[PDB]
Design a binder for this molecule. Structure first.
Ligand SMILES: *CCC(=O)N1CCN(c2nnc(-c3ccccc3)c3cc(-c4c(O)cccc4F)c(Cl)cc23)CC1
Ligand SMILES: Nc1nc2c(ncn2[C@@H]2O[C@H](COP(=O)(O)OP(=O)(O)O)[C@@H](O)[C@H]2O)c(=O)[nH]1
Ligand SMILES: [Mg+2]
Length: 160
């Protein structure tokens, strides 16, 4: 039985809240208040081991981020600016965590949408350059949502 502090980061409107609420409440919330930043808790079993997840859904400071054990780097597959922002979020995290190996997962959300502007290959190549996994999600359909969070827990376990 182990605890994990997870932090969900990424540009405004990529689906941080939608992803987190899907994980916790098992339904899709359209346009969750973009200014609400809160922590959520969920107990799960991953690879046989019971895990309590403490999840911070960041919104509109260093202290909270330093206590994070792993980070979901979320962009939206129809929003190139959010994908370009990922390297900046990565840099901010490394600086506050002291540029050490920090468990992270790259998450490409909104996979249900047709107007794609970032391809999986691009995201895989970015994830490869950081030595982290890439997971594609849709908070709307729930595809990949558990995978993103569970993969992060696995990355934290490998680090610990
Ligand atoms: C629409 C409201 C929303 O969802 N917000 C979350 C994203 N917020 C935000 N914007 N910019 C930066 C940033 C990124 C790179 C360089 C400067 C500023 C944000 C950074 C962080 C952050 C910090 O400050 C430290 C460690 C890890 C981080 F992700 C956060 Cl938490 C949020 C940032 C705008 C509001
Ligand atoms: N089509 C689609 N829309 C999404 C998805 N995830 C979030 N959204 C929508 O994208 C917008 C931003 O989502 P939100 O969770 O508020 O993003 P946040 O600012 O990162 O917390 C909202 O209008 C959501 O309903 C998704 O997977 N697919
Ligand atoms: Mg939000």
């Amino acid at each position: 039985m182990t605890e994990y502090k997870l932090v969900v980061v990424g540009a405004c409107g990529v689906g941080k809240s939608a992803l987190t609420i899907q994980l916790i409440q098992n339904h899709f919330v359209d346009e969750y208040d973009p200014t609400i930043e809160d922590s959520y808790r969920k107990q799960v079993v991953i690879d046989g081991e019971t895990s309590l997840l403490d999840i911070l859904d960041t919104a509109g400071r260093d202290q909270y981020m330093r206590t994070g054990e792993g980070f979901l780097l979320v962009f939206a597959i129809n929003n190139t600016k959010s994908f370009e922002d990922i390297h900046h979020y990565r840099e901010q995290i490394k600086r506050v965590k002291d540029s050490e190996d920090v468990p992270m997962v790259l998450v490409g959300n909104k996979s249900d949408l047709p107007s794609r502007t970032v391809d999986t290959k691009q995201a895989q190549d970015l994830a490869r350059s950081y030595g982290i996994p890439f997971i594609e999600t849709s908070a709307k359909t729930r595809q990949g949502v558990d995978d993103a969070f569970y993969t992060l827990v696995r990355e934290i376990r490998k680090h610990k």
